[PDB]
Amino acid sequence: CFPITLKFVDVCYRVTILSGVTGMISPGEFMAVLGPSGSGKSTLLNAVAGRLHGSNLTGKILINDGKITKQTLKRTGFVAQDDLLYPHLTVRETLVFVALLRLPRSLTRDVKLRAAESVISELGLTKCENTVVGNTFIRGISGGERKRVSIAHELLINPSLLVLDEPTSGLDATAALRLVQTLAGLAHGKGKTVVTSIHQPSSRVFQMFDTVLLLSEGKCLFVGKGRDAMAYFESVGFSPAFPMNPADFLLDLANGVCQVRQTLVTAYDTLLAPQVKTCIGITTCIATWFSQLCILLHRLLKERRHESFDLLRIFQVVAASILCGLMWWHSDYRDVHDRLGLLFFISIFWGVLPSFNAVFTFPQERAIFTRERASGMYTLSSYFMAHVLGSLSMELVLPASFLTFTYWMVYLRPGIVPFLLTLSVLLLYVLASQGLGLALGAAIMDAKKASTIVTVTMLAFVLTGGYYVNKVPSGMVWMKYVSTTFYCYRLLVAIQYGSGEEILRMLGCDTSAGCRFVEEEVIGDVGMWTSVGVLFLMFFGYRVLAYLALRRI
Amino acid sequence: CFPITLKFVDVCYRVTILSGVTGMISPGEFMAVLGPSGSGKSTLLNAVAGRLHGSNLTGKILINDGKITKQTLKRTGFVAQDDLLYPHLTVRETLVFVALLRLPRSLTRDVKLRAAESVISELGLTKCENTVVGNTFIRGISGGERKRVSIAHELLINPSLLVLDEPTSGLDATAALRLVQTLAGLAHGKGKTVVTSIHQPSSRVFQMFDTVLLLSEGKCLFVGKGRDAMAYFESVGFSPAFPMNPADFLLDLANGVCQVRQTLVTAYDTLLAPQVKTCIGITTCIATWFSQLCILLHRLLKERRHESFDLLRIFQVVAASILCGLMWWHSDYRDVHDRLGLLFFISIFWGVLPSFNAVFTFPQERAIFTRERASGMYTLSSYFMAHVLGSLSMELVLPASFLTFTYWMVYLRPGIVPFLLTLSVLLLYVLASQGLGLALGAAIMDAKKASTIVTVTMLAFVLTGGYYVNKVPSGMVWMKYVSTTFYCYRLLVAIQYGSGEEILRMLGCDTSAGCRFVEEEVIGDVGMWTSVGVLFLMFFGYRVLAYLALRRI
Numbered sequence A, B: 001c002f003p004i005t006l007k008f009v010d011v012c013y014r015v016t017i018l019s020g021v022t023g024m025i026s027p028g029e030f031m032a033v034l035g036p037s038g039s040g041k042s043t044l045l046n047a048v049a050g051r052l053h054g055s056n057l058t059g060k061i062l063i064n065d066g067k068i069t070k071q072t073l074k075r076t077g078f079v080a081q082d083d084l085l086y087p088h089l090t091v092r093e094t095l096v097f098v099a100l101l102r103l104p105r106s107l108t109r110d111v112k113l114r115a116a117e118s119v120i121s122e123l124g125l126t127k128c129e130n131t132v133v134g135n136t137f138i139r140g141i142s143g144g145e146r147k148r149v150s151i152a153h154e155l156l157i158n159p160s161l162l163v164l165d166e167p168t169s170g171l172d173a174t175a176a177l178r179l180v181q182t183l184a185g186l187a188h189g190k191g192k193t194v195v196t197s198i199h200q201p202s203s204r205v206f207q208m209f210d211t212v213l214l215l216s217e218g219k220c221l222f223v224g225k226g227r228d229a230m231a232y233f234e235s236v237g238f239s240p241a242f243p244m245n246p247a248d249f250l251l252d253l254a255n256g257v258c259q260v261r262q263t264l265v266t267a268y269d270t271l272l273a274p275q276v277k278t279c280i281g282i283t284t285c286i287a288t289w290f291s292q293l294c295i296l297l298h299r300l301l302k303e304r305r306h307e308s309f310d311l312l313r314i315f316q317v318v319a320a321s322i323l324c325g326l327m328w329w330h331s332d333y334r335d336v337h338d339r340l341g342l343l344f345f346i347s348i349f350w351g352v353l354p355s356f357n358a359v360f361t362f363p364q365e366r367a368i369f370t371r372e373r374a375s376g377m378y379t380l381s382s383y384f385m386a387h388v389l390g391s392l393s394m395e396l397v398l399p400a401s402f403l404t405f406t407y408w409m410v411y412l413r414p415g416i417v418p419f420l421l422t423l424s425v426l427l428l429y430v431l432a433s434q435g436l437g438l439a440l441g442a443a444i445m446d447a448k449k450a451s452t453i454v455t456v457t458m459l460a461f462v463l464t465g466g467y468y469v470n471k472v473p474s475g476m477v478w479m480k481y482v483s484t485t486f487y488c489y490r491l492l493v494a495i496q497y498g499s500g501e502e503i504l505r506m507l508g509c510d511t512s513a514g515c516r517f518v519e520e521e522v523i524g525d526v527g528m529w530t531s532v533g534v535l536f537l538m539f540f541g542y543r544v545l546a547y548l549a550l551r552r553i
């Protein structure tokens, strides 16, 4: 193994939440960053892992007596408090995909699979490797297993310095003890440098750590051996008045509640601090981008299959198709108004549903994307393109089945050519609306606010679709040309009626009002090819804007 | 005070989570119910407070050496783990409303207010009495303060038996310690019989219970004084091998892991269990219903104001109004098709918004309602009617402003009489659609499923509203007669055009298709009075069905 002797001196995160903190941890030591809420333990462990930087951070952080560099980040892993795992991917599949993404591409796929399986077996996940990870919504692995998977995500890289952040927070006592035992075995058996910040450790848990460092409102008050806390603190003059837990005594004293803070921090600076101070390729790029794309597509296929194929959504589409095939059951080709209403309702449904359902995919996965992009698992372009391709594959199945039922139940324009034409138009419109939803959900990451914004914009698109109101004011017809629903409706009308020659012959005109009812509603101001071109342009441009918005964050 | 002594013997909850649990708690005893997860602490606490009953519970529970009666429940409280508080009510207002609903009506309102203020001061909430309670969404009081408010809710009845199911779960160490201090003061200063199922207490927290009782897989492992656990267990033969927290050691022994369960259970049954066993007016109804209605209306006014006037909902309504006033800006009266499209769009918007928003009011409060219905705070009829009245008052402001802007930015039928006619029709339609949403959200209690069902049924209503398709199949025309949107659309058409005499004179009509396009659209198959009566009938019947569904649960 490549050992890491991590050190930190005078690290003060002056915003203060950190000041006057020093010490070190040697390889094979199981660290304990204890302290109460707001004492800077999480801040200290984020800073020591390279997450925090800039003028807000002072002091020195040394890795093997050297400044933290890129190779350091390649050799140290950080387990954040928030477990950002894909709910519908099993533990084995999740960590296999992570190993494929973050391990160097020089390693063969079989070698990455073997490493992933070894990591599964080492962390005790082999009993639930085939169990779906799940989340609070869909049942899956337990909290301890979820945190173990989160650690394993940072263990496939094989780091000697593993900096966890509250791994037993919100965990069962037995499960927390088992996880702390696993961390201690990693520090001892694997010879790793494990640094963890346990919120409120238990008794056996406190017995597990080989080295304890606790702060006090941003000031490190005691750094030393795990079992040397009691002796040092009774030497200072602070002793339990009852059978107090060493961890509980340590935390309660951190607040200054004993029998305080200033006298004992001075004592630490005069007795223990001196002791701890004296103790111290273009084709290759294309290939890797495409492999990242493939791995991300395979890992998000389950997410799309449970998101785009939601049973509630499936029932929604089925009910819409049944209502379409019953309301327009064997609809006459000559009934211009009813057929146009059907086409406009199809446009409304398949513009509202895809955009609305897409507007959440980016806000709900933003945390996972940021966590896995800051670690270098994949680039933004590859992740965004894989998301776009998977959603393209999965958001057309429901409209395709809907149209397959409706077109033949309604008795629309017969033949196979107009069925493929209207199916292509409907799928392109669904893709364009979905891209608009993606752009709106990426521009701002508030899921509810983005939902309201896409609702407002598609309400505007529908009201300008050319059906509800035909005599648009001269100062408002401009918006009609930027509405996806308008172009879809015009394409559907052109497929069903063409230039309206046959329907105009049926009407007779080529009454003034009757002619107008079939003149502007059937023969629009946009050609059949111009509408297709603008639909494709919007399909590309909305996703381009979504990618730019992702680049903004 | 009225001292109360719980005396439970052989309390086993088959179909096991409890078996052979024996013990008692006297006034002034701050008993703790310790044990690992699933050992039966919560189940025993619920059963000992009267929550659990039936053949599933076997054994004997005595209150003041007598069987639990209805009068006892008026003297025993129960602080459940789930804090069911209205987020937008301040602590003072929340607990004043709770005191009004809970304390007997013979007490004057000023006396109830004084009792509520005294309870605020006693539990340390006087520093945050004016602070909005909030929840995970809207910021407010802390978790410890939230649990304190729950305890106060269970304390306004003034019970001498407080039964706190996991009150420090999710609480900070200092917050949990302070809450346990408050509970100990309640047990000692107020002479109350306080029993709690502490999950994982700290050292001070463990020191603060006068007596403790442990669960081990449903068996009473040790009952006695809080400070006698260590001595009794070293007498048995179990001693800490390290400095171990008495609570932590107690829980670890309860898990059976110790350097076990069966032999020590036998030892308890041999030594300590024998010791415990040896120690073992219709006008008044109307007045109270109306006072409950008024109090619930005042308590839910803030919820409706921050729910029916959501900034996202307000933005949606404003955007819809602006799009109505722009798309149909200075709309001509003679333009029958565009006017009918505007009316149908109004019907769609104001049948979808309230129906969708109503399917969440009942589920998101259901638990709270149950928590405040089994305890006898109010009856189902009063709560449901207060909810209906508040939603009636608060769900008409947005449609009223929307129509006020649209009617005069679109140039519909001028004058004041048709404006109030269309406003009354729109508000009645909003009420009917909201009642449909309430009925569908009460029939099934899942918010997402209710939303999907209500949107499917409103999709059916809109597709049969008489605008999208006019030549309805003979086997499908029955649905339009049960569609709220259809009746609203017909009423709007009758307001804007009446019998269509003026527009027919404008057209000169009496081609045939052009004449029918207006005759079948403007002149429907339902009269104005018939549509109004059916709208009112549906408004009443949907809420009746919602009340019946609430009665089902």
Ligand SMILES: CC(C)CCC[C@@H](C)[C@H]1CC[C@H]2[C@@H]3CC=C4C[C@@H](OC(=O)CCC(=O)O)CC[C@]4(C)[C@H]3CC[C@]12C
Binding pocket: A348, A352, A360, A447, A448, A449, A451, A452, A455, A458, A459, A462, B316, B345, B348, B349, B352, B353, B356
């Ligand atoms: C015939 C044309 C006009 C149809 C176009 C749809 C519109 C009528 C708009 C106006 C009211 C809109 C609704 C207003 C408010 C909401 C709440 C909103 O709730 C959320 O933010 C849910 C977030 C989540 O699910 O996580 C979901 C969209 C929805 C139903 C909107 C969906 C689109 C609606 C139905």
Ligand SMILES: CC(C)CCC[C@@H](C)[C@H]1CC[C@H]2[C@@H]3CC=C4C[C@@H](OC(=O)CCC(=O)O)CC[C@]4(C)[C@H]3CC[C@]12C
Binding pocket: A316, A348, A349, A352, A353, A356, B348, B352, B360, B447, B448, B451, B452, B455, B456, B458, B459, B462, B463
């Ligand atoms: C053309 C006319 C009839 C307008 C109605 C068509 C669409 C605008 C509707 C039909 C189905 C609706 C969906 C039905 C169910 C829901 C679940 C809902 O999720 C919730 O439960 C959110 C709860 C919350 O808002 O807090 C989010 C909106 C959504 C997808 C709805 C969005 C609006 C949709 C697409």
